[PDB]
Symmetry: D2
Amino acid sequence: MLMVKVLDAVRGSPAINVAVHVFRKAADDTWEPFASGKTSESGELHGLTTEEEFVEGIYKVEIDTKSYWKALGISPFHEHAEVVFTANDSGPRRYTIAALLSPYSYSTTAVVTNP
Amino acid sequence: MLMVKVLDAVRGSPAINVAVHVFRKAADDTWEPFASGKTSESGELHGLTTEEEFVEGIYKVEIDTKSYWKALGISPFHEHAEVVFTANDSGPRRYTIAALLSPYSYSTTAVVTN
Amino acid sequence: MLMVKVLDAVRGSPAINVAVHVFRKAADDTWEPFASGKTSESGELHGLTTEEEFVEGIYKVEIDTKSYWKALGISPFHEHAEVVFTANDSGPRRYTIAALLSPYSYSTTAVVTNP
Amino acid sequence: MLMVKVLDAVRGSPAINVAVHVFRKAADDTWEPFASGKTSESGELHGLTTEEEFVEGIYKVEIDTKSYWKALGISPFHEHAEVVFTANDSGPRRYTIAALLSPYSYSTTAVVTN
């Protein structure tokens, strides 16, 4: 129900092997680890969660942009990119989180569809 | 030495009266309040820090995008936008953090000049 | 070999039924009509061209953003979004042209892969 | 009354010495040169027009992005970036056309203020 897609705006390609960590805000206001993975050769990350597991709450997706640029020999500005949102508060939805990466800039977009 | 600029991509205007909070990373890996304010009529926020207090370290700029959209009666996706970066003395000195806001998308850009 | 994808950053959804016109620069420096279509319900447009037809040259993709926003009751800034690029100059490639639309802003990204 | 600002997203800096050409649509649906220049050290271009010459109509701003990237030795995708818009007297008066450049992506934003 949660997919992450990452593009490289410098090379015009998917961002491959980018680490992604997802957290869920617990009842005590701390960030609990929820899921993690790495983008595939198409720059996508699927299978982070199931419908039963993906309950209502506040989630944070943290994308390790810094390691990505370093391995390409570029010293980027940001430590990472994070996306924080409330999910499922009016029923289950499919969430696609897209990120477009440049060394000193990034964009993030959400596409939300009703399964 | 740190300047924040916020633009509204729906109305083509500065994003006015947006709350901004700046944090510095402490030794215990905790975020401590450092500065804050609200963007002006030109969507800018200046005078958050001085060259003396702005030492090397990791900083987080949090922009309350959700309240901005709610005031316009538009339902947004993100809870806020966060920009996290390391400040380095070698060797460019002025940091402009720009943010371009839409309800389901934002971009942020850093302009670092001397 | 040419695909166009359009997203709506105001609604968090694909941009559906957006008109797209593609032109190729002729030998006399004029823009010849090459192909056209409308984005589907996933905001995508496939099948604009074939490999035999998609020769080396300069192409322009014009996306009718203005009609899209008007039909939603918004008066946008731009007349359209156009993307102009040289294609296939070092052999056939697959081109994905992505556009992210807001009323007073747009972004366009190209993903180029080797078939 | 028309201002162009260009930023480089790879180096986090103003895009300096970028060529900009502005055209106005003629009755024959043809584009006629109207103004031009090169961005300054702050990546800005001012004084392209006056309030008197800037009448209602359709304008095209063409930014030579390809030459900018080539000078840095980076191969870009686009031939240039074009921004086409209608200017309207009712009723906000100053137009800032911003562009944020990467080799395979650009964004453009209009800020229209009074």
